[PDB]
Every structure is written in structure tokens, then in C-alpha cells.
Amino acid sequence: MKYLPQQDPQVFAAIEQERKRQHAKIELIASENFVSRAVMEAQGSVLTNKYAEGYPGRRYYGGCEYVDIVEELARERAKQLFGAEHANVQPHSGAQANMAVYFTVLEHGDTVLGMNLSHGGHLTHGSPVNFSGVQYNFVAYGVDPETHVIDYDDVREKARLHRPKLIVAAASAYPRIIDFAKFREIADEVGAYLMVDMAHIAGLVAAGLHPNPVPYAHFVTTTTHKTLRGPRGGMILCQEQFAKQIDKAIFPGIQGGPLMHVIAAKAVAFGEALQDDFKAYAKRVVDNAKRLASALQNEGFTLVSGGTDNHLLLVDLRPQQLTGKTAEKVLDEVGITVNKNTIPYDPESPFVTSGIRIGTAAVTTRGFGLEEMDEIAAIIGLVLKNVGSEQALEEARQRVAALTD
Amino acid sequence: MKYLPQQDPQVFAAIEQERKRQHAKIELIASENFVSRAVMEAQGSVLTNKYAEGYPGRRYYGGCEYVDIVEELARERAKQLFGAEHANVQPHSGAQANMAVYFTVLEHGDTVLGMNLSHGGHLTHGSPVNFSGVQYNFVAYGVDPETHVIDYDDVREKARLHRPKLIVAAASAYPRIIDFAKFREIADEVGAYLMVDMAHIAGLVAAGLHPNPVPYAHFVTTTTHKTLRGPRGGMILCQEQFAKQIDKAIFPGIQGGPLMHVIAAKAVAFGEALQDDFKAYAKRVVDNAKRLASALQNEGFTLVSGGTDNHLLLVDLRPQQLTGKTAEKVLDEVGITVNKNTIPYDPESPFVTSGIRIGTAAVTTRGFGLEEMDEIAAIIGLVLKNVGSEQALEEARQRVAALTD
Numbered sequence: 157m158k159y160l161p162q163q164d165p166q167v168f169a170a171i172e173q174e175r176k177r178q179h180a181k182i183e184l185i186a187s188e189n190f191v192s193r194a195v196m197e198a199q200g201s202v203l204t205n206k207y208a209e210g211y212p213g214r215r216y217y218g219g220c221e222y223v224d225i226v227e228e229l230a231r232e233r234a235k236q237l238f239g240a241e242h243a244n245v246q247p248h249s250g251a252q253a254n255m256a257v258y259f260t261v262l263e264h265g266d267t268v269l270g271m272n273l274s275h276g277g278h279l280t281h282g283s284p285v286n287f288s289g290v291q292y293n294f295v296a297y298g299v300d301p302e303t304h305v306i307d308y309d310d311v312r313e314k315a316r317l318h319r320p321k322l323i324v325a326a327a328s329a330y331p332r333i334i335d336f337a338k339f340r341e342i343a344d345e346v347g348a349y350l351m352v353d354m355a356h357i358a359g360l361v362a363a364g365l366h367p368n369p370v371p372y373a374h375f376v377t378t379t380t381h382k383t384l385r386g387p388r389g390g391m392i393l394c395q396e397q398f399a400k401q402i403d404k405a406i407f408p409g410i411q412g413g414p415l416m417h418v419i420a421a422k423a424v425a426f427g428e429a430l431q432d433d434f435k436a437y438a439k440r441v442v443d444n445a446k447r448l449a450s451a452l453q454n455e456g457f458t459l460v461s462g463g464t465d466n467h468l469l470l471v472d473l474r475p476q477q478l479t480g481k482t483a484e485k486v487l488d489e490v491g492i493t494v495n496k497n498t499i500p501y502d503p504e505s506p507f508v509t510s511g512i513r514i515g516t517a518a519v520t521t522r523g524f525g526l527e528e529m530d531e532i533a534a535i536i537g538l539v540l541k542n543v544g545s546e547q548a549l550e551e552a553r554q555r556v557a558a559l560t561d
Numbered sequence: 562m563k564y565l566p567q568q569d570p571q572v573f574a575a576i577e578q579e580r581k582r583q584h585a586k587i588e589l590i591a592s593e594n595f596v597s598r599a600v601m602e603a604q605g606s607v608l609t610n611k612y613a614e615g616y617p618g619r620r621y622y623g624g625c626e627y628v629d630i631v632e633e634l635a636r637e638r639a640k641q642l643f644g645a646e647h648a649n650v651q652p653h654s655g656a657q658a659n660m661a662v663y664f665t666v667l668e669h670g671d672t673v674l675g676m677n678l679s680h681g682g683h684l685t686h687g688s689p690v691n692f693s694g695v696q697y698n699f700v701a702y703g704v705d706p707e708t709h710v711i712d713y714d715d716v717r718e719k720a721r722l723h724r725p726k727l728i729v730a731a732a733s734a735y736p737r738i739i740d741f742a743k744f745r746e747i748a749d750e751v752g753a754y755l756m757v758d759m760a761h762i763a764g765l766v767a768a769g770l771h772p773n774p775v776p777y778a779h780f781v782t783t784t785t786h787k788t789l790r791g792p793r794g795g796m797i798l799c800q801e802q803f804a805k806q807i808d809k810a811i812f813p814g815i816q817g818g819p820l821m822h823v824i825a826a827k828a829v830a831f832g833e834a835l836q837d838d839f840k841a842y843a844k845r846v847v848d849n850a851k852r853l854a855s856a857l858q859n860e861g862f863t864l865v866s867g868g869t870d871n872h873l874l875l876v877d878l879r880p881q882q883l884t885g886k887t888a889e890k891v892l893d894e895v896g897i898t899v900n901k902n903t904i905p906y907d908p909e910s911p912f913v914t915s916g917i918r919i920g921t922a923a924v925t926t927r928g929f930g931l932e933e934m935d936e937i938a939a940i941i942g943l944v945l946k947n948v949g950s951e952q953a954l955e956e957a958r959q960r961v962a963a964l965t966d
């Protein structure tokens with residue numbers, strides 16, 4: 157940085173603290189990642205100065221010839237990555253991508269069926285303090301109490317009983333592959349649209365390591381910043397038949413001018429995801445998650461669903477008599493970042509919880525491999541089994557520093 | 562740029578075209594501006610990697626100590642700039658800032674009174690193809706047919722008749738000072754909240770060149786990218802009594818994770834606006850707009866409301882027998898960027914219009930002064946009075962190039 161240090165010492169000092177923090181900690185928050193320098197440069201460009209309401213070649217302002225090229229690169233690369241017939245790369249976030257699909261096919265008060273929030277569903281999938289839950293009537297399907305795998309008979313029974321206009325599949329904390337074919341089969345049975353929110357697994361889908369929802373869902377939403385390793389923002393994928401309606405939902409529907417500099421960064425990230433090394437990266441994410449899962453089981457931890465098929469895992473801390481809040485707090489003391497997270501049928505509230513959610517996308521981006529996963533599990537075992545020992549916590553801090561350098 | 566050119570030649574080439582385009586044209590779109598290098602560096606930072614749902618000191622993720630500092634700098638500097646009791650700097654855009662206020666005080670179907678869209682009101686102030694118009698019952702107040710100044714008796718009559726739960730004041734194309742005191746007096750008479758969308762005039766308000774809506778409105782919304790000259794995004798200002806509700810409307814209400822890198826850029830822009838030179842800049846914006854207005858009247862153009870009190874002006878092209886669409890297209894041929902814009906009581910549709918909207922914030926940022934305004938007016942006169950002469954258009958192109966270098 158050159159101009160920021162001189163113009164704003166306070167903002168620069170804080171950014172520099174954050175940059176060093178990102179290097180020093182072991183980041184296991186499942187929705188995080190580290191973007192490339194090229195992606196950051198695209199978002200730090202002069203494209204923030206351009207008003208470009210509308211779409212490429214159909215803008216409401218002149219002079220959009222070059223931001224049109226950028227937006228089409230993003231759309232075409234997204235289409236090649238996921239094999240979608242249409243893409244909308246304007247959503248400002250995952251929340252706005254979801255909001256626009258809901259705005260497209262639902263009327264106020266319509267019934268929507270989504271994953272139980274305490275079993276893995278997202279806030280925008282029906283929380284009563286979110287617009288989804290306030291605007292529409294959400295009903296939920298759950299996972300089996302023992303396997304923790306989505307109960308497809310429960311999805312079907314709820315759909316047939318409540319007759320939702322839309323069914324939402326996917327999650328913020330589900331460690332197994334989701335069967336989109338079954339979701340579409342149930343949606344067809346009850347005449348509902350199917351929306352798949354693939355935010356967490358988008359990079360895995362792009363690398364062929366998770367079944368692609370595109371062929372089964374009417375609408376596919378996602379964030380560009382989780383396993384896809386792009387800038388923070390959203391995207392909607394859909395068949396040509398809903399293209400005009402989805403585009404109108406985003407604009408003039410729910411947003412105004414798009415963030416053209418962030419769209420440039422989305423294009424860059426999509427170009428990175430089309431390369432062979434991104435596929436190797438994604439495989440290492442899943443391999444590392446499996447290894448981490450196995451190593452944690454070796455320390456004596458119980459994992460929701462017994463392991464993982466993707467980038468994330470959930471530890472059920474009940475056997476250790478710990479809440480997720482306690483575990484999150486003590487891991488923060490040693491330099492390991494996780495989130496408390498409810499587990500299916502959790503006896504505790506969502507503010508306390510009985511679990512922690514962990515993902516490997518970020519540590520894989522920084523170059524960690526199987527040996528590092530074994531050590532991370534060993535450190536978490538040392539800390540969580542010895543929460544009252546300051547000597548064990550200091551040892552963990554030294555082991556974390558050895559991993560991050 | 563260093564990494565982008567090598568990672569993505571296509572995206573880099575397009576960005577570079579856009580950068581050169583921004584230098585080569587005379588940018589008169591009233592909502593645009595050019596951000597500083599420091600603001601761009603803040604948005605091109607590693608803060609895009611951090612999940613930070615919640616607010617400073619009340620986050621849902623650990624490790625937010627440093628992004629908390631950045632967000633508080635933004636909030637505190639916003640509060641000093643506008644004298645507000647509370648600020649929310651998380652809105653992703655002006656559309657999301659407006660959406661959150663509506664979500665805070667309105668129920669689906671409530672009546673809202675806002676400025677007629679064809680007299681200056683914004684799309685998010687009731688358009689039937691926007692969420693505002695679909696979700697709520699909007700009614701509109703207009704400007705006087707001759708003075709083009711808001712008819713405060715019309716605001717009051719519509720409020721008393723329709724009994725809106727909320728009244729919205731401010732606009733995307735109103736060239737005169739808005740009397741917020743009268744708006745609050747009418748709102749109090751009918752028991753309605755008052756929301757002021759100051760997006761266009763925020764920089765002028767910060768420099769004391771436009772009356773501040775903060776003391777009169779329950780809620781003040783704005784974009785950070787127009788006259789405020791910040792990164793693209795939104796912000797909400799309000800009294801301490803609605804702080805918790807406004808914060809909850811943004812999150813968990815209508816958004817998810819905030820764009821922390823864009824919030825860092827908002828802080829930077831707010832720091833720039835607190836400096837004495839920003840006040841001098843803003844004065845030049847208004848001085849230049851007046852000068853430009855006067856010079857256009859000298860060429861024979863009619864201006865909506867007869868001139869301007871702010872950064873923008875509207876030309877009524879009926880006297881020249883031109884539509885705004887025709888004028889916008891021929892000015893684009895010579896390197897001058899304007900927007901077609903309806904004028905009050907326009908006989909043409911919003912897609913054709915009888916006017917063009919022009920603003921001076923961007924050319925003032927690049928250093929243009931009174932002599933440049935006279936020349937810009939002279940060039941627009943030459944072009945619009947000689948639309949069929951390729952010699953006049955080529956002369957205009959050479960005069961535009963002389964101004965931009």
C-alpha cells in the first residue's frame with residue numbers, strides 16, 4: 157500500500173493488524189478463505205467509480221462498454237464452471253442472491269420448505285428475525301437423529317403436507333453430500349420450484365468433488381467468497397427460461413447499481429477456478445477435511461454424521477461435557493479460530509450450543525496438508541481435554557505458532 | 562497493478578480501458594465521482610477475507626478485534642460529519658440502506674408517501690417494478706408545474722388524505738434545496754415517520770452547503786459514493802432511540818456478512834470529508850453547478866426550476882425540439898457523458914424523456930473550475946444546436962479533448 161498509510165494512519169494501522177492476524181492464526185471458520193492478490197487488485201480498481209444499472213449491452217447509463225466486457229467475462233466463466241445456461245453476477249451478497257430468487261417466485265406469505273436452521277440451514281432459509289422468515293411462511297425438514305444425514309422421507313412428508321411453492325436445499329453446516337436429484341424428485345411431486353443454495357460447496361462443485369445442483373434446480377444461489385475463493389458477494393445461476401425474471405429481480409427489483417469492481421474480482425476468481433490447479437486445491441480441501449475428521453476421532457471426539465464428505469465438519473462436544481461457546485473461547489486463547497455451532501437435536505440454545513464447526517478451505521489455501529491436519533487435531537485435543545491447564549494452553553500456543561511460522 | 566496483469570490479461574485489459582475512458586471523457590453523470598487512491602487501496606485490502614456478522618464488540622465470529630476498529634472509525638467519523646447520534650455503515654448499497662429502513666418501520670402493504678418518480682424521486686421510492694412499490698403502497702407528491710419546486714401544500718394534502726406510515730423526502734434529480742423542516746412538520750401532523758434519502762447531496766450536507774436532514778428526520782439514508790466521494794455502498798443515520806432496531810434490520814434482517822474492506826474505504830472517505838479541503842471542494846462543486854447552469858442559459862437552454870442550489874441541473878430540451886435520448890446519444894459521440902432524465906410533467910416516457918441530467922461533482926474532483934464550466938456549456942450548445950453537422954461534432958470532440966488533455 158502506498159497512499160493509504162499517508163492519508164489514514166488509523167485505518168492503515170488496523171488493516172495491518174488484520175493482515176498480520178490472518179497470518180498468525182489457524183483459521184478454521186468453514187466459510188472463510190484467502191483471496192489471491194489479483195482478486196484484491198480487481199476490487200481495488202477504478203471500477204468503483206462507474207454507475208452501471210442494467211446488464212451488459214442493456215445499461216441505463218452510457219460509457220459502460222468496458223465494464224460490460226468485465227461483467228460478461230464473469231457471466232461466461234461462471235457458465236463454463238458450473239455448466240449453467242444463465243448467470244447473474246450482480247448480487248451484492250449471498251443474502252441478496254437468496255432475496256432475489258425469493259422475490260422472483262414467491263408472493264408475501266407463500267410457504268417455503270427449507271433445512272431446519274439448527275440442523276444446518278442458513279439464516280436466510282427461514283429465520284424469524286430475517287426477512288425470509290418475516291416475509292414468507294417457512295417450514296423445515298430435518299436430519300436423522302442418529303446418522304445426522306438429511307431425512308429425504310422427512311423432506312417429502314413436509315412437502316406433501318405443507319405444499320410449499322418453493323423448496324430450498326443446502327446449508328451452512330451440513331458435512332455430507334446433498335442429493336439434489338431426490339430434492340428435485342420431491343419438488344416435482346408437489347409442484348414446487350427447487351432452489352439450491354450452494355454457497356459453502358461452490359468451489360467443490362466447480363472441481364467436480366460435489367454433485368452439481370445446476371441440472372436439478374430451477375435456481376442455484378451462492379456466495380463467491382467461501383470454497384469458490386472469490387471476493388465477497390453473491391451470484392445466481394439458472395436456466396435460460398428464468399433468466400429475464402432473475403435479472404429483473406436483481407435490477408430493478410432488489411438492488412440499484414452493481415459493484416463493478418467486485419464483479420471484476422468475481423471474474424478473476426472464476427478464471428482461477430477454471431484452472432487445473434484449482435481442482436487440485438479443492439481435492440486437498442476435501443482430503444484435508446477427511447484427514448482432520450479422522451485425526452479428531454483419533455483424539456476421542458465425536459463428529460456429527462460420523463465424518464464429512466466435503467470441506468467441513470462438526471464436533472459434538474457433549475462427550476467432553478463442553479458447550480461450543482466454551483470450546484470456541486478457549487481455542488481463541490491459543491490462536492485457533494472456530495465457530496460454536498448447534499448440532500442436530502442440540503439441547504442447548506444457538507447462542508451456547510453443543511458443538512464447533514470447522515472447515516479446511518483457508519488452511520488448505522495457505523498450503524497446509526495431511527501432516528498439518530494431524531497436528532491441528534492434536535492441538536485441539538490437548539486444549540479441549542485440558543481447558544483448566546494454563547500449561548497445556550501455552551503449549552498449544554507454541555504449537556500453533558510452529559504451524560503458522 | 563502487479564498481479565492482475567499476469568493472472569488475468571482479459572480482465573486487466575478491460576479495467577485499463579475503463580481507467581483511460583474515465584480520463585478521456587467529460588463525466589457529467591450527476592451521481593458519479595472519482596475516489597482517491599487511499600479509498601481504492603482500502604477496498605483492495607485483505608479485509609474481504611473476514612466474516613464479521615454482527616457489530617463491533619457484538620460479533621458472531623471471533624477474531625474481529627481489528628475489523629471492529631475499522632467499523633467504529635467509520636461510525637464515529639460519520640457521526641462527527643453529520644452530527645448523528647448513531648450510524649450503521651454496513652448497508653451494501655443505497656438500495657439496501659433504504660430497504661432496511663422500510664423493513665424497520667413498515668409492514669407489508671403499509672402506505673408510504675414519496676416524491677413522484679418522474680419529478681425527481683428515486684426507483685426505491687415506490688417504483689412498481691422495485692421492491693418498494695411491490696411491497697408497500699406508495700403515493701406521491703409533486704413539484705409545482707411552473708417553478709418545479711416541491712409543492713409543500715401537495716406533500717401535506719397527500720399526507721392528510723392517504724395517512725402514510727412513513728414519508729420519504731429527497732431525490733435523484735431535484736436541483737433545489739429540500740426543506741426538511743417542512744417535511745417533519747407535515748409528518749408530525751399526520752403521525753408519520755420521516756425518512757430523508759440524502760444520497761445525492763450527502764457531500765454538500767457534510768460541507769454545510771445544504772441543510773442537514775439529521776435534526777429533522779427519524780431516519781437518514783445515503784449512498785457513500787455520490788457527492789460524499791466514497792466507495793460504492795450505503796449508510797443509515799438515526800437517533801439513539803432507533804439504533805438497535807436499525808442495526809437489527811441490517812443484520813440479521815436483510816443482509817449477512819458486511820463488506821469489511823468497503824467499510825474500511827467508507828472510513829477513509831469519511832476522514833477525507835472531515836478535512837478542510839473537502840469543504841473547499843464541495844463549495845467548488847456548487848459554484849461550478851451554478852456557473853454551468855448560467856452558462857447553459859446563456860446558450861439558450863431552459864433549465865428545470867430555472868437553475869440549481871446544489872451539484873445538479875436538469876435541461877428541459879423541449880425548446881430545442883429534442884428528446885433526452887437524442888441529446889444523450891449525440892453527446893456520447895463527442896465524449897460528454899450525461900443521462901436522459903424525465904422533467905416534471907414530461908410529455909415523453911421515462912425511456913425517451915424531454916431532458917438531460919448533469920452534475921459537476923466528478924469534473925470538480927478532477928480540478929475543473931468556472932472557465933471549464935463555461936467551455937462545457939459552449940460545447941453542449943454547439944452539439945445540441947447542430948445535431949446533424951458532423952463538422953460541429955468533430956469540433957466538439959477536439960474541444961472535449963482539449964479539456965481532458
Ligand SMILES: Cc1ncc(COP(=O)(O)O)c(CN[C@@H](CO)C(=O)O)c1O
Nearest residue numbers: 187249250251278327328353355817818
Ligand atoms: C448457505 C449460505 N447462504 C447464504 C449465506 C449468506 O451470505 P452473505 O454474503 O453473508 O449474505 C451464507 C453465509 N454463511 C455464513 C454465516 O451467515 C457462514 O459462516 O456460514 C451461507 O452459509
Ligand SMILES: Cc1ncc(COP(=O)(O)O)c(CN[C@@H](CO)C(=O)O)c1O
Nearest residue numbers: 412413592654655656683732733758760
Ligand atoms: C436518492 C438515491 N437513493 C438511492 C439510490 C440507490 O443506490 P444504489 O447504491 O445504486 O443502490 C440512488 C441511486 N441513484 C442512481 C440511479 O439509481 C443515480 O444515477 O442517481 C439515489 O439516487
